[PDB]
Paper text:
DprE1 is the first of two enzymes that catalyze the conversion of decaprenylphosphoryl-β-D-ribose (DPR) to decaprenylphosphoryl-β-D-arabinose (DPA). In its natural context, DprE1 catalyzes the oxidation of the 2′ hydroxyl group of DPR to give the ketone decaprenylphosphoryl-2-keto-β-D-erythropentofuranose (DPX), with flavin adenine dinucleotide (FAD) acting as the oxidant in the reaction.
Compound 2 is the four-electron reduced form of 7, also referred to as hydroxylamino-BTZ, and was synthesized as a potential noncovalent inhibitor control. However, it turned out to be a novel mechanism-based suicide substrate (see later). The progress curves for 2 were also time dependent, which was not expected given that this hydroxylamine compound is the two-electron reduced form of the nitroso derivative, 1. These data could be explained if 2 is an alternative substrate of Mtb-DprE1 that reduces Eox to generate an ERED:1 complex, followed by covalent bond formation with Cys387. We incubated 10 µM Mtb-DprE1 with 20 µM of the hydroxylamino-BTZ 2 in the absence of FPR and resazurin and monitored the intact mass of the enzyme by mass spectrometry. The intensity of both species decreases with increasing incubation time, and two new species appear with molecular weights of 51986 Da and 52162 Da, which are 340–343 Da higher than the two starting species, consistent with the formation of the corresponding semimercaptal covalent derivatives. The orientation of covalently-bound 2 in the active site of DprE1 is similar to the nitro and nitroso congeners. Therefore, 2 is a true mechanism-based suicide substrate of Mtb-DprE1 because substrate (DPR or FPR) is not required for covalent modification of Cys387 to occur. Very remarkably, 2 was very potent in the enzyme assay, surpassing its nitro analogue, 7.
Numbering used by the authors: 7 to 45, 48 to 268, 284 to 319, 331 to 461
The structure:
């Protein structure tokens, strides 16, 4: 079931024609890899295509669409383990798991992502500072490697090196077929949330450094990257935790695990309204309200700067607002500890996502941003990238050589390849 198809990432740029295999038959997939391994443009897995860049395409090669492998094999409330095919998506998983009092332990800002894509990008969420990234919660996975064998990987077993190279490995160690995830127990589908509004970058940072982060499992902020200082870096901060049944109002206690401008705006009254609106304590909120509040020709850019380099982070934010490039939708968060995966994106520090309209000079400006991010100890996220250079990437990820070595062992013939692997010289 092969079709020549034109593939892009979610950004709809850097287009690339590939032979797309789409089949629910795992044995067909094993044979397609073993076939590619005989004859040399290789293969890469694809999930739901929500990564903005070029990690899920392979120009003139094979792309295996994993979404048809979407069986949930089992869910267990006592062990908190789910056993699922890699093509299962987090929305599907959230729905299926709620009736067991289980919560998907790491959720990104859209639930249309596959488990395979979640592992391969080692995705993070609003709870990174309390929960780590997705890879921290994988207890096993079955990896179809270049030799056509399916390998059972665990984080502390004898194949730990390959497991942790696969986490964050952008599909370049093989095809994740199936995994077991440890879910988070919950008594409800709701959050209890506190809101705070700051008037400056200095305050934003202050709020995230005063120790209050430890009282919240989930935390993120909308961020002003346009206004000149002092307003620059002012934020609507939303923080919280999963509610217990005891904390819900009467109306919702019976089904606790359910799911289902003007002239004033820019002046003093507007400022007061927004400040009041964004300030609250103990507000009960569902998933959409707390986690996806947005449900009511761009360049996506995300970077993190090590915690200690706070002055340097501020400098970068100033560079952005003074650039002449205007990003209105900005997400800020303080990441917590990193994990063992050599290519994992998150590190403890100041994370920000920005979104720039594509216009003259942007390309060259974002290259300079890369340079500053690199210089200040930070990195970019592959899930949001199609334009950075191999030299920059390699310097941002000093464990890349360590990772490349692992990849060479498991794929000596370069059976697995993508546009991204060639661009960033991970091939
Ligand atoms: C609106 C929006 C919000 C987002 N918010 C966040 C966020 O808050 N946090 C965050 O971390 N990310 C976020 N992302 C990025 C997204 O979580 C990742 O890009 C994710 O990897 C996409 O999953 P996918 O199934 O669509 O994978 P694809 O984009 O199809 O593939 C991405 C990578 O995963 C690999 N892959 C997919 N399936 C398999 C498999 N079975 N075996 C091996 N490799 C595989 C591919 O080869 C590729 O390298 C967001 C994206 C969007 C569009
Ligand atoms: N940046 O991609 C980013 C980061 C985080 C983080 F807090 F976990 F770090 C969350 C996050 C999100 O929830 N949603 C994002 N989307 C959807 C809403 C509009 C902008 C893109 S981005 C994001």
């Amino acid at each position: 079931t092969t079709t020549a198809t034109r593939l892009t990432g979610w950004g709809r740029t850097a287009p690339s024609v590939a032979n797309v295999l789409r089949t629910p038959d795992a044995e067909m997939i094993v044979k397609a890899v073993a076939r590619v391994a005989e004859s040399g443009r290789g293969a890469i897995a694809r999930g739901l295509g929500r990564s903005y860049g070029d990690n899920a395409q392979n120009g003139g090669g094979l792309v295996i669409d994993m979404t048809p492998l979407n069986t949930i094999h089992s869910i267990d409330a006592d062990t908190k383990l789910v056993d699922i095919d890699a093509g299962v998506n987090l929305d599907q998983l959230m729905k299926a798991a709620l009736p067991f009092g289980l919560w998907v332990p790491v959720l990104p800002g859209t639930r249309q992502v596959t488990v395979g894509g979640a592992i391969a990008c080692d995705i993070h969420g609003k709870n990174h500072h309390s929960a780590g990234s997705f890879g921290n919660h994988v207890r096993s996975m079955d990896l179809l490697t270049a030799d056509g064998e399916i390998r059972h990987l665990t984080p502390t077993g004898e194949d730990a090196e390959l497991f942790w190279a696969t986490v964050g490995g952008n599909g370049l160690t093989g095809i994740i077929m199936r995994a077991t995830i440890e879910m988070t127990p919950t008594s409800t589908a709701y959050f209890i949330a506190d809101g705070d509004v700051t008037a400056s970058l200095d305050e934003t940072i202050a709020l995230h450094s005063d120790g209050s982060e430890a009282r919240y499992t989930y935390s993120s902020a909308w961020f002003d990257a346009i206004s000149a200082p002092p307003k620059l870096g002012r934020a609507a901060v939303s923080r919280g935790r999963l509610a217990t049944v005891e904390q819900l109002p009467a109306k919702l206690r019976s089904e606790p695990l359910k799911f289902d401008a003007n002239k004033y705006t820019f002046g003093p009254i507007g400022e007061l309204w927004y400040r009041k609106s964004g300030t609250y304590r103990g507000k009960v909120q569902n998933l959409t309200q707390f986690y996806h509040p947005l449900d009511m020709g761009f360049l996506q850019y995300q970077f993190v700067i090590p915690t200690e380099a706070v002055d340097e982070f501020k400098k970068i934010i100033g560079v952005i607002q003074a650039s002449g490039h205007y990003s209105f939708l900005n997400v800020f968060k303080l990441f917590g500890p990193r994990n063992q995966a050599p290519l994992s994106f998150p590190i403890p520090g100041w994370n920000i996502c920005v979104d720039f309209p594509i216009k003259d000079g942007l390309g060259k400006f974002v290259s300079e941003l890369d340079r500053r991010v690199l210089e200040f100890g930070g990195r970019l996220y592959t899930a949001k990238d199609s334009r950075t250079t191999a030299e920059t990437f390699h310097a941002m990820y000093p464990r890349v050589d360590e990772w490349i070595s692992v990849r060479r062992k498991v794929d000596p013939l370069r059976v697995f390849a993508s546009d991204m692997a060639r661009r960033l010289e991970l091939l």
